Structure 1
Amino acid sequence: RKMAFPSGKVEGCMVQVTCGTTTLNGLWLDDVVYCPRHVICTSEDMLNPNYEDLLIRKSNHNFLVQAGNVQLRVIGHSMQNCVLKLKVDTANPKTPKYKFVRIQPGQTFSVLACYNGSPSGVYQCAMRPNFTIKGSFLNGSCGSVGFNIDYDCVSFCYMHHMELPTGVHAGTDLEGNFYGPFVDRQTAQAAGTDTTITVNVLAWLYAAVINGDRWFLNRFTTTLNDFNLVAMKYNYEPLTQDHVDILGPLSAQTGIAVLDMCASLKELLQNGMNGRTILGSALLEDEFTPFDVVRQC
Structure 2
Amino acid sequence: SGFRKMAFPSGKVEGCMVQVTCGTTTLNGLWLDDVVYCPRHVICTSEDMLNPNYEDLLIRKSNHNFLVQAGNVQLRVIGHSMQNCVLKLKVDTANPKTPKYKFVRIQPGQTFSVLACYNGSPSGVYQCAMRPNFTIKGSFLNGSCGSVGFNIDYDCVSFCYMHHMELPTGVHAGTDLEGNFYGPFVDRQTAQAAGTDTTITVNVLAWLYAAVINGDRWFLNRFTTTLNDFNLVAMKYNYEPLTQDHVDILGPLSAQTGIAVLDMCASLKELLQNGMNGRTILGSALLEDEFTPFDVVRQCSGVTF
Q: TM-score scaled by structure 2?
A: 0.96
Checking the alignment, whether the CA contact within 8 Å between 2:39 and 2:145 is kept in structure 1 is yes
Matches within 5 A, 1:219-238: 219-238=222-241
1:13 touches 1:28 (CA, 8 Å); kept in 2? yes
Is 1:24 aligned to residue 24 of structure 2?
no
Is structure 2 residue 119 aligned with structure 1 residue 116?
yes
Runs (4+) of structure 1 exceeding 6 A deviation are: none
CA distance in 2 between counterparts of 1:186 and 1:68 reads 31
Give 1:187 shift: 3.0
* Aligned twin of 2:303: none
User: What does the per-residue CA deviation read over 1:155-180, in whole Å, with 9 as the maximum and x for residues that have no partner?
Assistant: 00000000111011000000000000
Q: Distance in 1 between matches of 2:57 and 2:237?
A: 46
Distance in 2 of aligned mates of 1:186 and 1:7: 32
Q: Does 1:271 align with 2:239?
A: no
C-alpha distance after superposition, 1:115-168 (max 9, x if no partner): 000000001110001100010111100000000101110000000000111011
Aligned residues: 297
* Aligned mates of 2:281, 2:87 — CA distance in 1: 44
Structure 2 SS opposite 1:103:
coil
RMSD value, Cα: 0.7
Shift of 1:189: 1.4
Distance 2:165 2:190 in 1: 10
Distance (whole Å) between structure 2 residues aligned to residue 167 and residue 282 of structure 1? 23
Quote how far apart the aligned CAs of 1:288 are.
0.2
Give the secondary-structure state (helix, strand or coil) at the position aligned to 2:98: coil
The CA deviation at 1:274 is 2.1
> Matches of 1:242 and 1:112 in 2, distance apart?
31
Provide the rounded CA distance (Å) in 2 between the counterparts of 1:290 and 1:239: 13
Task: Find the residue that maps to 2:69 and give its secondary structure.
Answer: strand
State percent identity of aligned pairs: 100
With structure 1 as the length reference, what TM-score do the two structures score?
0.99
What SS does the corresponding residue of 1:230 show, helix, strand or coil?
A: helix
Following TM superposition, by how much is the alpha carbon of 1:44 offset from its aligned partner in structure 2, in angstroms? 1.0
Q: How far does residue 53 in structure 1 lie from its aligned partner after superposition?
A: 1.2
Partners of 1:179 and 1:113 lie apart in 2 by 18
Q: Deviations over 1:218-269 (max 9, x none)?
A: 1111000110111011110111111101101111111100000000000111
How far off its partner does 1:186 sit? 2.0
Q: Give the Cα–Cα distance (whole angstroms) in 2 for the partners of residues 78 and 275 of structure 1.
A: 56
> How much has 1:191 moved relative to structure 2?
2.0
Gaps of 5+ in 2: 301-305
Aligned to 2:196: 193
Does 2:13 align with 1:44? no
Within a 5 Å distance, the mapping from 1:89-238 to structure 2 comes to 89-238=92-241
The answer as to whether partners of 1:165 and 1:188 remain within 8 angstroms in 2 is: no
d(CA) in 2 for partners of 1:224 and 1:253?
21
* Paired residues of 2:169 and 2:194 also in contact (CA < 8 A): no
CA distance in 2, matches of 1:51, 1:232: 42
Q: CA deviation at 1:52?
A: 1.3
Deviations 1:26-85 (A, max 9, x none): 000000000001000002111111111111111111100000110001000000010000
Q: In structure 2, the residue corresponding to 1:44 is in which secondary structure?
A: helix
Report the Cα distance in structure 2 between the residues aligned to 1:271 and 1:49, rounded to whole angstroms: 51
Q: C-alpha displacement at 1:105, in angstroms? A: 0.5
Q: Give the conservation status (yes or no) of the 8 Å contact 1:113–1:122.
A: yes
CA deviations over 1:187-223 (Å, ceiling 9, x no partner): 3411221010000000000111111101111111100
Secondary structure, counterpart of 1:26 in structure 2: strand
Contact 2:50 2:190 in 1 (8 A): yes
Greater mean alpha carbon deviation, residues 216-225 or residues 25-34: 216-225
CA contact (8 A) 1:112 1:144 kept: yes
Separation in structure 2 between the aligned mates of residue 119 and residue 39 of structure 1, nearest angstrom = 19
Distance 1:151 1:126 in 2: 20
Residue 273 of structure 1 and its aligned partner are, at CA, apart by: 1.4
Q: Is the 8 A contact 1:164 1:188 kept in 2?
A: no
Report if the CA contact (8 A) 2:117-2:147 is conserved: yes
Q: Is the 8 A contact 1:181 1:191 kept in 2?
A: no
Partner SS state of residue 108, structure 2: coil
- What CA distance in whole angstroms lies between the structure 2 residues aligned with 1:273 and 1:47? 47
CA spacing shift, 1:274–1:188, aligned 2, 3 Å: farther
- Check conservation: 2:211, 2:281, Cα contact below 8 A: yes
